[PDB]
CSV table of C-alpha atoms in Angstrom, one decimal:
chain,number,residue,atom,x,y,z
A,149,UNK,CA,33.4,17.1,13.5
A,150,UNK,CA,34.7,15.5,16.8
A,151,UNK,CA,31.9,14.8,19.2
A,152,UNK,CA,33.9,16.4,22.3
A,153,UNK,CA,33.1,17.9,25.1
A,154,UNK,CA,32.8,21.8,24.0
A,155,UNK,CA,33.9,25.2,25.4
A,156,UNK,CA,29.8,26.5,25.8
A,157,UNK,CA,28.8,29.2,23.5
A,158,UNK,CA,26.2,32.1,25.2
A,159,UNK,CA,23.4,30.3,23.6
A,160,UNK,CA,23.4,26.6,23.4
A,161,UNK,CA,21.3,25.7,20.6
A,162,UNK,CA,18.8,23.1,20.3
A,163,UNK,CA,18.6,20.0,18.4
A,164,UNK,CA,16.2,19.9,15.3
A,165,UNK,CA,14.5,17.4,17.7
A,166,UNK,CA,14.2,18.9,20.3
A,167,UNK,CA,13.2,22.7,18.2
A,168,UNK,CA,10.2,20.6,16.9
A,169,UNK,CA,9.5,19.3,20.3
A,170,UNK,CA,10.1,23.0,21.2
A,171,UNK,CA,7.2,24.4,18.7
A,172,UNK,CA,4.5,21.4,19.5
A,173,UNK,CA,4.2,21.6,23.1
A,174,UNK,CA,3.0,25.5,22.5
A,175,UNK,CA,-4.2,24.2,24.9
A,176,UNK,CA,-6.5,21.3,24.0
A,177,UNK,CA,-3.8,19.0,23.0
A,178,UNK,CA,-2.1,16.6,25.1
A,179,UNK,CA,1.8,16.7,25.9
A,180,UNK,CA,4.1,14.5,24.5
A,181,UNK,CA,5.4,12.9,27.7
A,182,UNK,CA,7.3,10.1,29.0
A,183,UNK,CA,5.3,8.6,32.1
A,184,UNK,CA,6.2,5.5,33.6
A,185,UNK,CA,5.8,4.7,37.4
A,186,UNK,CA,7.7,2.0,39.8
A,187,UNK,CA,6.1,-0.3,42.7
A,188,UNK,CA,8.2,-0.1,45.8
A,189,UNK,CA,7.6,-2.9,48.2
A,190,UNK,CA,9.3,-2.9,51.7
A,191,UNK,CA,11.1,-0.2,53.8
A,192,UNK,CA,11.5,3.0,51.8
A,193,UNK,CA,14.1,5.8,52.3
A,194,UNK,CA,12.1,8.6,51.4
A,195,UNK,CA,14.7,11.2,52.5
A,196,UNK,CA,17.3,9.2,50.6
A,197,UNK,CA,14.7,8.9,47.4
A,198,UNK,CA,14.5,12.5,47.4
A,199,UNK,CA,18.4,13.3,47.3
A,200,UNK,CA,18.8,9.7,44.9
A,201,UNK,CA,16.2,12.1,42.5
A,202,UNK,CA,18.2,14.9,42.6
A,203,UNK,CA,21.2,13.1,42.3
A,204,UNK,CA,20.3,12.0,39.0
A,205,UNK,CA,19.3,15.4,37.5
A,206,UNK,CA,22.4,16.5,38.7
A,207,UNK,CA,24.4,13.8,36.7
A,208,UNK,CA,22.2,14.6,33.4
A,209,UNK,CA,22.5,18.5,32.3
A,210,UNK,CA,19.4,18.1,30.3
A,211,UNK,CA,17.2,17.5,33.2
A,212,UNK,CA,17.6,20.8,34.7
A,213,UNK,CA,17.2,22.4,31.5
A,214,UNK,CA,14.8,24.9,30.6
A,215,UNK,CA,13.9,26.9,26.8
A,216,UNK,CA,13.0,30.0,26.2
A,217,UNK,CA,12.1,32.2,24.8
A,218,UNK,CA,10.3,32.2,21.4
A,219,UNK,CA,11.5,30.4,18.2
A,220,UNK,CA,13.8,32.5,16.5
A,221,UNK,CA,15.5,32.4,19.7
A,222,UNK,CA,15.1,29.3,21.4
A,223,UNK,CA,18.2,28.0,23.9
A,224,UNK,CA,19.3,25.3,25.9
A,225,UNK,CA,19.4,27.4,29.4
A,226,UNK,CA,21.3,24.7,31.9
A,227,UNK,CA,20.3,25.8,35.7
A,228,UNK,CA,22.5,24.1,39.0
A,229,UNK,CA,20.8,20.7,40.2
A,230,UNK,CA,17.4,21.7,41.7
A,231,UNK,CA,16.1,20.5,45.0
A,232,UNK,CA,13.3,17.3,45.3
A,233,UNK,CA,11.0,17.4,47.5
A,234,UNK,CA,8.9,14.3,47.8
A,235,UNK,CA,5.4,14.6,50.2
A,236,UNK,CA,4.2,11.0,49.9
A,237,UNK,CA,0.3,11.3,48.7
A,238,UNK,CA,-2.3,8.4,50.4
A,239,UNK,CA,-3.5,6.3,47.8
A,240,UNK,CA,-5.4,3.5,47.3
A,241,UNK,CA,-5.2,0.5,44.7
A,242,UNK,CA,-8.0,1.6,42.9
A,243,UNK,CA,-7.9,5.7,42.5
A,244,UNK,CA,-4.3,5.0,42.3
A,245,UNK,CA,-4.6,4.9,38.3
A,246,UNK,CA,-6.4,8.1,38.3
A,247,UNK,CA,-3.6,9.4,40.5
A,248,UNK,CA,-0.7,8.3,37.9
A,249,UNK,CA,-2.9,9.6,35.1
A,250,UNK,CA,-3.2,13.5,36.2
A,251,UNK,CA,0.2,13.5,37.1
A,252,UNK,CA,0.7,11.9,33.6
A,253,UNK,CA,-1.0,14.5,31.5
A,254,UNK,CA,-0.3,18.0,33.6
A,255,UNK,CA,1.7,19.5,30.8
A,256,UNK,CA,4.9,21.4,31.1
A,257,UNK,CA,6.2,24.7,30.8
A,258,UNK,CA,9.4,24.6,28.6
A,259,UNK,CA,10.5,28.1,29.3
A,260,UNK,CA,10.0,28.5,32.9
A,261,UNK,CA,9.5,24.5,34.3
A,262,UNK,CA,12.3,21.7,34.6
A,263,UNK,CA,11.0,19.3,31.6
A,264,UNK,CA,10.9,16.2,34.5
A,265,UNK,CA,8.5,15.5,37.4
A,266,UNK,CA,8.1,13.1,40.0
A,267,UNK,CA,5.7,12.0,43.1
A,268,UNK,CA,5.5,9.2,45.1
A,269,UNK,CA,2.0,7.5,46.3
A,270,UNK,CA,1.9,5.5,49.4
A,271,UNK,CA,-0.5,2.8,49.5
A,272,UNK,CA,0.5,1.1,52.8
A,273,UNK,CA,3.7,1.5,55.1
A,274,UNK,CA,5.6,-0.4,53.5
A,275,UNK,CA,4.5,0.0,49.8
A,276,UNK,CA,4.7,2.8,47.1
A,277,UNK,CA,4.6,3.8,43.8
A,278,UNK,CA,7.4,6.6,42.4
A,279,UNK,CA,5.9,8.3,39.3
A,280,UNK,CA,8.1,9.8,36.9
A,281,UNK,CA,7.6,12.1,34.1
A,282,UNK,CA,9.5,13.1,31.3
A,283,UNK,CA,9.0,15.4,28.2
A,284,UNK,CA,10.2,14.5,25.1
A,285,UNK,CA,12.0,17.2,24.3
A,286,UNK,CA,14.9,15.8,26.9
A,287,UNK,CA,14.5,12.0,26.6
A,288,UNK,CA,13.5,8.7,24.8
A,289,UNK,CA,13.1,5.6,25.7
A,290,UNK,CA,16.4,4.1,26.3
A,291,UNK,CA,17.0,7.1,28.4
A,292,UNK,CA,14.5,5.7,31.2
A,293,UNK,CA,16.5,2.6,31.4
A,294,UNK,CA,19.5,4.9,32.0
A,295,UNK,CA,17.1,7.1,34.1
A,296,UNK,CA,16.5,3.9,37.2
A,297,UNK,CA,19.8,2.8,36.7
A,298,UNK,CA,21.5,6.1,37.9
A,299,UNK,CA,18.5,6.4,40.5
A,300,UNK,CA,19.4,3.0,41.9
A,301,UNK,CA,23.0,3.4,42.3
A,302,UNK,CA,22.2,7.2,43.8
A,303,UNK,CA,19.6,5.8,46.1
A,304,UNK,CA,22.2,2.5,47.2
A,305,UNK,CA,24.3,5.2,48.5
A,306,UNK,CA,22.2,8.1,50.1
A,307,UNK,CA,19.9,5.1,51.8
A,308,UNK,CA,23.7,4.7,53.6
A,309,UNK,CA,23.8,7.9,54.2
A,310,UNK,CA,26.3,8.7,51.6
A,311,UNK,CA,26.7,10.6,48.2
A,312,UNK,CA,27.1,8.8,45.3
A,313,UNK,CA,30.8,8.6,44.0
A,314,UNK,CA,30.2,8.2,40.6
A,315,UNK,CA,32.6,9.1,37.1
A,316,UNK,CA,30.8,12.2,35.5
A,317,UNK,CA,29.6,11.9,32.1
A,318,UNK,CA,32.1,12.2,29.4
A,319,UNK,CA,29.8,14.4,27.9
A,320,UNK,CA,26.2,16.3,28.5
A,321,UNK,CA,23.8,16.9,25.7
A,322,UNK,CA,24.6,20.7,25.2
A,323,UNK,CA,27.7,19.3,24.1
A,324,UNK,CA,26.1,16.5,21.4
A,325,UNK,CA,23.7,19.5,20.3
A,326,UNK,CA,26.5,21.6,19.3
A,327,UNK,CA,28.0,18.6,17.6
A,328,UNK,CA,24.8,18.9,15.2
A,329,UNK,CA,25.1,22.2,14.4
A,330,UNK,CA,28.5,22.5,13.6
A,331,UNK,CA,27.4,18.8,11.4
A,332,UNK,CA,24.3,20.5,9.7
A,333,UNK,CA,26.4,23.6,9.1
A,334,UNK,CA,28.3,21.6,6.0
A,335,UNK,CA,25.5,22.6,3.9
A,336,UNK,CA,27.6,25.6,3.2
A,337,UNK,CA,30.5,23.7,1.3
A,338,UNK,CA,29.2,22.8,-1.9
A,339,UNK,CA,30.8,18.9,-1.8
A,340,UNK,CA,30.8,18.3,1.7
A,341,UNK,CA,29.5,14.7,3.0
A,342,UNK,CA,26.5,16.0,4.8
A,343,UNK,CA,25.0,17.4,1.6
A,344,UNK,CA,25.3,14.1,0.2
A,345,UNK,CA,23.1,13.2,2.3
A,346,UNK,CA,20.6,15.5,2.1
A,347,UNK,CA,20.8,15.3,-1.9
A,348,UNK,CA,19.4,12.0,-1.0
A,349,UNK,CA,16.7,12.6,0.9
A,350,UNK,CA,15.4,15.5,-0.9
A,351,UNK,CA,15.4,12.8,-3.9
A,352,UNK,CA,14.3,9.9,-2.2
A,353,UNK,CA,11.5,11.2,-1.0
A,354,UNK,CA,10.2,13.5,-3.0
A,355,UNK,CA,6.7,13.7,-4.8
A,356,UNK,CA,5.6,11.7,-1.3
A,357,UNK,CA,1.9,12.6,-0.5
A,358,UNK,CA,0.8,15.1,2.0
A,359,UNK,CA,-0.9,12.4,3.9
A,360,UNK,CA,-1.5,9.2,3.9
A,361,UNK,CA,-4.9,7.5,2.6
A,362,UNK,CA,-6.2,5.7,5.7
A,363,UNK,CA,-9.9,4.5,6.8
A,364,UNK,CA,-10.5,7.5,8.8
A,365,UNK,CA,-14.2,8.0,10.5
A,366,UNK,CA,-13.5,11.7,11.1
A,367,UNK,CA,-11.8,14.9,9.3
A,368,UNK,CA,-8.7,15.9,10.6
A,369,UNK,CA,-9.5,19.0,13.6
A,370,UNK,CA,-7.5,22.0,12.8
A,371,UNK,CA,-5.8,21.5,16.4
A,372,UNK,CA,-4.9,17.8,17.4
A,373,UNK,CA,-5.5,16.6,20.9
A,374,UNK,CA,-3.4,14.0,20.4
A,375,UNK,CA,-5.7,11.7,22.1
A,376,UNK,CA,-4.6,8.1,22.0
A,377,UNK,CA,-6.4,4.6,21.8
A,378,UNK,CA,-4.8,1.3,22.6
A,379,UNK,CA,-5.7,-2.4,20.6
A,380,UNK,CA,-4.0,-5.4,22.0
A,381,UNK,CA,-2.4,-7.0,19.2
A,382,UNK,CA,-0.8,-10.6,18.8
A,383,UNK,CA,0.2,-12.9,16.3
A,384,UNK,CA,0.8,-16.6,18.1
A,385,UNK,CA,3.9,-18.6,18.4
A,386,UNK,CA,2.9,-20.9,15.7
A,387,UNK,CA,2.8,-18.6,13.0
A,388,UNK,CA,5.6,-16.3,14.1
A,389,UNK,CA,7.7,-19.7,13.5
A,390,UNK,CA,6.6,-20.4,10.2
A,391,UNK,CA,6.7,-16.7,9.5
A,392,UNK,CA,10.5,-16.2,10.5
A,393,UNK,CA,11.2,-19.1,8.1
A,394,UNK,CA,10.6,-16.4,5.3
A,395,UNK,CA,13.0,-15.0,6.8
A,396,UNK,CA,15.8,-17.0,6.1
A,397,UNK,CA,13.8,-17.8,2.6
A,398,UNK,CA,14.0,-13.4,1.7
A,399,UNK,CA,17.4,-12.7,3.7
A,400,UNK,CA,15.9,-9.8,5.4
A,401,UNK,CA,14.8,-9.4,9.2
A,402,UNK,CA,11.6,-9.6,10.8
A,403,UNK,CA,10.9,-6.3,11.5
A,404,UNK,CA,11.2,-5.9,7.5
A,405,UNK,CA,9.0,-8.4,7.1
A,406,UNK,CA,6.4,-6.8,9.3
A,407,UNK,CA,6.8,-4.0,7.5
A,408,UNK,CA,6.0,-5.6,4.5
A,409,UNK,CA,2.7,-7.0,5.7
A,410,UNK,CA,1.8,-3.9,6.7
A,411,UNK,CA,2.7,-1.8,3.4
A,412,UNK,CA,0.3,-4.5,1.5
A,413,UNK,CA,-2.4,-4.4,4.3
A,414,UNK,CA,-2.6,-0.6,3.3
A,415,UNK,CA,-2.5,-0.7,0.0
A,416,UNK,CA,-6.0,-3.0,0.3
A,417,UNK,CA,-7.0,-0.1,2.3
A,418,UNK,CA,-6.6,2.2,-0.8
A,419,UNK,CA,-3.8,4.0,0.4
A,420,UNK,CA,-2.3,3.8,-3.2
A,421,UNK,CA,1.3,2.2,-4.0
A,422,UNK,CA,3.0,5.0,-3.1
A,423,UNK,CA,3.5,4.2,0.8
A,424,UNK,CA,5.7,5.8,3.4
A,425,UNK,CA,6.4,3.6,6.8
A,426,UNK,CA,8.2,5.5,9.4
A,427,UNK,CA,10.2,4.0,12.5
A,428,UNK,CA,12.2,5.1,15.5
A,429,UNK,CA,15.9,4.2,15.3
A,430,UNK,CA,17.8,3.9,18.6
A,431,UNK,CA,20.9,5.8,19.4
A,432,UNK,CA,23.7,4.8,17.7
A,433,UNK,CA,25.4,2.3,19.0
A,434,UNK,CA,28.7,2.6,18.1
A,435,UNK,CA,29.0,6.0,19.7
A,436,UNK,CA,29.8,4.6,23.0
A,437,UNK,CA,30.0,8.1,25.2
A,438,UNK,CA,25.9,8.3,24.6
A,439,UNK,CA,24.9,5.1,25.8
A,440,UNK,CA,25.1,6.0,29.7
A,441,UNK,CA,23.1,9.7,29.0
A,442,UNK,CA,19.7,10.8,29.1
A,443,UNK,CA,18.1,12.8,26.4
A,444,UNK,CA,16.1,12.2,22.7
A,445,UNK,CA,18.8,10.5,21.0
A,446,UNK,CA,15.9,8.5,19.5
A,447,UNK,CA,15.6,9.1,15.6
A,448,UNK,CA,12.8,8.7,13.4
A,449,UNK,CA,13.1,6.5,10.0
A,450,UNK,CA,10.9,7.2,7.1
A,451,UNK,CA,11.1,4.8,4.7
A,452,UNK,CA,9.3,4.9,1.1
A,453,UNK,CA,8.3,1.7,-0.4
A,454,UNK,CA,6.6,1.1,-3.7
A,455,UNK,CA,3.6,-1.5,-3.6
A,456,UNK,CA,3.1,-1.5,-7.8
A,457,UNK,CA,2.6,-4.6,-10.3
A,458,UNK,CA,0.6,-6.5,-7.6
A,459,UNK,CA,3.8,-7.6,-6.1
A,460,UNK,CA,4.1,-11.1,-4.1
A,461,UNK,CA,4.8,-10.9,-0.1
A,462,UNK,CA,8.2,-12.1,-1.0
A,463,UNK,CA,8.8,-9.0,-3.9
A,464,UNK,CA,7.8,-6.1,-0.9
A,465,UNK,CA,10.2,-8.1,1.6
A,466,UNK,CA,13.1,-7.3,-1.2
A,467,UNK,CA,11.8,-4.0,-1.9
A,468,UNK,CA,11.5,-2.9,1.5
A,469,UNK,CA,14.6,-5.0,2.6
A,470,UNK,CA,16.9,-2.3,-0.4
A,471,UNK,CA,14.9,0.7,0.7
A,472,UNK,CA,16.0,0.6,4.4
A,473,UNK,CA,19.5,-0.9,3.0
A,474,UNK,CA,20.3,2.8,0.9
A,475,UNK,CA,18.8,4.8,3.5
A,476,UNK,CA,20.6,3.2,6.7
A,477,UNK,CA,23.8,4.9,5.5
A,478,UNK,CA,22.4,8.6,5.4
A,479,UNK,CA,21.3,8.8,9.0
A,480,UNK,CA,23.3,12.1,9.9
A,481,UNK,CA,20.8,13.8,8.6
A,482,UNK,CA,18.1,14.5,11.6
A,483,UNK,CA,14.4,13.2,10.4
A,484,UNK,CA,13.1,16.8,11.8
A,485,UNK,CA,15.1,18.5,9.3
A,486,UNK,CA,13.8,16.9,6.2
A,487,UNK,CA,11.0,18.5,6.1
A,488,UNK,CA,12.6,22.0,5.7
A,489,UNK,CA,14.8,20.1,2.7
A,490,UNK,CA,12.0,19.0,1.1
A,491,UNK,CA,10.1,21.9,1.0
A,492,UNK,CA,7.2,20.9,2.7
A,493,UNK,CA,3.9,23.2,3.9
A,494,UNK,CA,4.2,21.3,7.2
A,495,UNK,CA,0.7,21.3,9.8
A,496,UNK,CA,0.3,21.5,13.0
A,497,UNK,CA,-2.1,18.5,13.4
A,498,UNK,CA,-0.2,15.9,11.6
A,499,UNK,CA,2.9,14.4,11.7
A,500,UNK,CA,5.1,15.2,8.5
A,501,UNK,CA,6.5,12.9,5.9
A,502,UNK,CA,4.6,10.2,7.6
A,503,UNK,CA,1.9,9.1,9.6
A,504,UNK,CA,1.8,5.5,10.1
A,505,UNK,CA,4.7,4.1,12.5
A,506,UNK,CA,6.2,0.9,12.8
A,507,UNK,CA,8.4,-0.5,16.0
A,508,UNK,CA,9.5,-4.3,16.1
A,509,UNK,CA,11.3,-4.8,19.1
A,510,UNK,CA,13.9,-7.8,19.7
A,511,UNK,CA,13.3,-7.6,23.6
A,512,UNK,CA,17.2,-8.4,23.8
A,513,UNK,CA,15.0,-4.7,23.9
A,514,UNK,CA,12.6,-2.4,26.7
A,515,UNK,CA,13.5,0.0,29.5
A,516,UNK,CA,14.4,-2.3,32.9
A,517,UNK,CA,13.4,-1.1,36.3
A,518,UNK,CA,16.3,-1.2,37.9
A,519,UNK,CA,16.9,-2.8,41.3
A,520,UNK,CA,16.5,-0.4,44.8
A,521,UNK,CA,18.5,-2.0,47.8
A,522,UNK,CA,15.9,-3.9,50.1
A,523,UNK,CA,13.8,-2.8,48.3
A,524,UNK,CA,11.4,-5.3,45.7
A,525,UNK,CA,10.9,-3.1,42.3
A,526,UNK,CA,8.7,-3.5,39.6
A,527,UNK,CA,7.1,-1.2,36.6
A,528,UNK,CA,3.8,-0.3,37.2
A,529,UNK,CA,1.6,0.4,34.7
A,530,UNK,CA,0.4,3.7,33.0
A,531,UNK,CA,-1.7,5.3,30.8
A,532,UNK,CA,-1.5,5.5,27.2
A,533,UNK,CA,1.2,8.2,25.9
A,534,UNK,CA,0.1,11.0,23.6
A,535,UNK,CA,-0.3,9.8,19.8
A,536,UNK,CA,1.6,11.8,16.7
A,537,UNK,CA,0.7,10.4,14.3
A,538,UNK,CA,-2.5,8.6,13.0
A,539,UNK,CA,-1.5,4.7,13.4
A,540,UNK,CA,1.4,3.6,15.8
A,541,UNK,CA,2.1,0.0,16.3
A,542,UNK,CA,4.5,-1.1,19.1
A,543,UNK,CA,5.2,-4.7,18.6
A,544,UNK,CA,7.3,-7.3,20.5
A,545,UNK,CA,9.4,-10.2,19.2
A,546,UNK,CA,8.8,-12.7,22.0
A,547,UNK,CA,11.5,-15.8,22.6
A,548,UNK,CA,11.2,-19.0,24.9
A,549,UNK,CA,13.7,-20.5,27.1
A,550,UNK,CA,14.7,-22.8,23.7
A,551,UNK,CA,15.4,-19.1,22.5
A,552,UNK,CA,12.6,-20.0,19.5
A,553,UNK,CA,9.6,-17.9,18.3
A,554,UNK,CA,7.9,-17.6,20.8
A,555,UNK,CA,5.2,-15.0,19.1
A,556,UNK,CA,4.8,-10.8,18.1
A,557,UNK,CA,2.9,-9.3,20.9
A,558,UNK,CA,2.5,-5.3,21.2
A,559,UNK,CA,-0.3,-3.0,20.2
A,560,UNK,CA,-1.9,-0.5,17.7
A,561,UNK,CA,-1.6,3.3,18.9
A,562,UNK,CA,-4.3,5.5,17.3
A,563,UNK,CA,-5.3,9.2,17.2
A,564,UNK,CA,-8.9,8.6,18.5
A,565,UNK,CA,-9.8,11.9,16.5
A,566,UNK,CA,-9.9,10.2,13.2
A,567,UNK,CA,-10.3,6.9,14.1
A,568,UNK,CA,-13.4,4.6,16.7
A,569,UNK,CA,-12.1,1.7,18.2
A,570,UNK,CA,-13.7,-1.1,16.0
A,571,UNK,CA,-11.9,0.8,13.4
A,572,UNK,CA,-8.5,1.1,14.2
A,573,UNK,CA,-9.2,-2.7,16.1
A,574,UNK,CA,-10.2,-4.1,12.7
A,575,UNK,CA,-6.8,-2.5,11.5
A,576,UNK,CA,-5.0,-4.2,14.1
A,577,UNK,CA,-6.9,-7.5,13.5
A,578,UNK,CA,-6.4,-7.8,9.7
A,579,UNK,CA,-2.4,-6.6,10.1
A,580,UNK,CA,-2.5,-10.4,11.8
A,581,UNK,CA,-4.5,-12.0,9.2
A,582,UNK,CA,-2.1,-10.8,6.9
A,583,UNK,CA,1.0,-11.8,8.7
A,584,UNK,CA,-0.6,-15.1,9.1
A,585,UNK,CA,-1.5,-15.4,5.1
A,586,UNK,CA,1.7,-14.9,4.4
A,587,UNK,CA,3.3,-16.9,6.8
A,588,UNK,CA,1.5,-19.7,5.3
A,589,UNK,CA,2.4,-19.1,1.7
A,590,UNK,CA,4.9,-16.0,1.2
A,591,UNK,CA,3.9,-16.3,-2.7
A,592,UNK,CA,0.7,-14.6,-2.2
A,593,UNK,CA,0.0,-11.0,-3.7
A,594,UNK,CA,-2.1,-8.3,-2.1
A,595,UNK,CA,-4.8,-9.6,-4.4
A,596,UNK,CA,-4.2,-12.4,-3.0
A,597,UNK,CA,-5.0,-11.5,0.3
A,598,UNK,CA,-8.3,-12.0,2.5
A,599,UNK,CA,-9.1,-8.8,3.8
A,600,UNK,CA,-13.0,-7.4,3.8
């Protein structure tokens, strides 16, 4: 299939991304949002920031786009751009955090509500803060870097007093989630390319366990609340260096080799040999028509590693290294799909396939605030997103000005129903020790390791 811009059909259907998105956010249990906030310092065009806002839904489809009604049913219903209005809310420095964090966590309706929202704080006359928040079900997080950059160039013109005279997108994301259906309908031909793929993942995957075996202090609730904890988590510059010479040594990359420390961390755990690591894969990139769009182009990765024969740090780097190698190739196939394929029972409380995640980030890279005319920008911070799955790490690889390692910052995500913090911080602790045994001597085997 050609992904073209599409004569629309009555019902534009969803992706299986955003159908799973669709069926979670139907209580208790925190939304899974996209909340990030800016710091505006000096002379602020709130009239033009409120037209600059709309402006930008009104360049994305998927931003004015509501879903109802019930699951067997479920539709992409695009609405005309709808107004902003921005009342500017008195805050100080210190409730201001308790102000982002409402805001933050006031779910949405997906059938009746617009799956964005904004406000905008003023803490002096000439210094705010814009919050903005997204559901998931209509971005990730590349499309917030996308989302400032179309605000700023919006808000450079209507701070002029004009409308922004932009190109319009080649294509929205009705048009990319009628591209997937007419991709996932190929399971109807008996020898088409798509069931190739799906052949693979019903094999590659399959006698996976239901969950993974991890430390946890509590049983799993019936409903999640997706409450989520936050460890810092660090491993210096001067093992990162020695580190990213097994690098070279294996041939693979460093997120691989993350992932490797991690597989054998859990194994010591007692989570068996038998492990499942899952990622979030970017867009793709050579598709060049979805780079400047907003919505959950994001894809999850599972990949299934075994951990057997007491293998050396080296062995899992290889094993992991041909695992994500084979699987790379069958990425057509949407992660939210598999689970259907593979016949799973599927809950409501945890994530399927897997439940530990893995992100290693190159910071080549993050979402940038983009610059407002005379106007100093920065990101402000937020609270902690809604967890998934159980464990969530979010690392960093940090450079220097020589453009050497410069250290792996981030930080462990956990679902505070199962775990306390010394736990899941003793988790995130020993993930370094690891990384740092390893580092030292990439011959060692997970019996070989120091862990308590």
């Amino acid at each position: 299939p050609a992904l073209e811009a599409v004569t629309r059909p009555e019902r534009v259907p969803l992706t299986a991304r955003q159908l799973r998105a669709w069926l979670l956010a139907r209580e208790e249990t925190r939304g899974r949002h996209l909340s990030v906030a800016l710091r505006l310092r000096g002379r602020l065009d709130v009239a033009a920031l409120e037209a600059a806002l709309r402006d930008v839904a009104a360049r994305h489809e998927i931003l004015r786009t509501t879903f109802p009604g019930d699951a067997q049913t479920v539709h992409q219903h695009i609405h005309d751009a709808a107004p902003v209005r921005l009342t500017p809310v008195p805050a100080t420095e210190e409730d201001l955090p308790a102000r982002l964090a409402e805001r933050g966590e006031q779910l949405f309706d997906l059938t009746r509500d617009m799956p964005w929202r904004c406000e905008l704080f003023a803490l002096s006359e000439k210094e705010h803060v814009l919050s903005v928040t997204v559901h998931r079900i209509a971005a990730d997080d590349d499309s917030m870097d996308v989302f400032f950059r179309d605000l700023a160039a919006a808000y450079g013109a209507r701070r002029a007093g004009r409308a922004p005279e932009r190109a319009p997108l080649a294509l929205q994301f009705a048009d990319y989630a009628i591209w997937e259906q007419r991709l996932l309908d190929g399971e109807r031909e008996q020898d088409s390319l798509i069931n190739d793929q799906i052949t693979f993942w019903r094999n590659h995957l399959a006698g996976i366990d239901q969950e993974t075996v991890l430390p946890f202090d509590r049983a799993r609730p019936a409903i999640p609340s997706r409450r989520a904890g936050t460890v810092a988590l660090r491993l210096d510059a001067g093992p990162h260096a020695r580190l990213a010479e097994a690098v070279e040594s294996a041939g693979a990359d460093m997120p691989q080799l993350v992932q490797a420390a991690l597989a054998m961390l859990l194994t010591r755990y007692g989570a068996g040999t038998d492990l499942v690591i899952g990622t979030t894969l970017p867009r793709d990139e050579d598709l060049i028509d979805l780079e400047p769009m907003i919505g959950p182009f994001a894809r999850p990765f599972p990949v299934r590693t075994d951990l057997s024969a007491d293998p050396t740090f080296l062995e899992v780097v290889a094993r992991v290294q041909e695992a994500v190698r084979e699987a790379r190739q069958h990425l057509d196939v949407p992660f939210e799909k598999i689970p259907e394929l593979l016949a799973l029972p599927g809950s409501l409380s945890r994530h399927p396939v897997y439940q530990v995640g893995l992100q290693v980030r190159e910071e080549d890279g993050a979402w940038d605030a983009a610059e407002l005319p005379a106007l100093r920008t920065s990101v402000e911070p937020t609270g902690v997103e809604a967890i998934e799955l159980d464990l969530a790490f979010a690392l960093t690889e940090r450079r220097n000005d020589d453009d050497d390692e410069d250290g792996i910052e981030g930080a462990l995500h956990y679902a505070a129903d199962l775990f306390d913090h010394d736990t899941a911080a003793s988790l995130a602790r020993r993930l370094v020790r690891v990384l740092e045994q390893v580092a030292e001597d990439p011959g060692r085997r997970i019996s070989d390791l120091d862990i308590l």
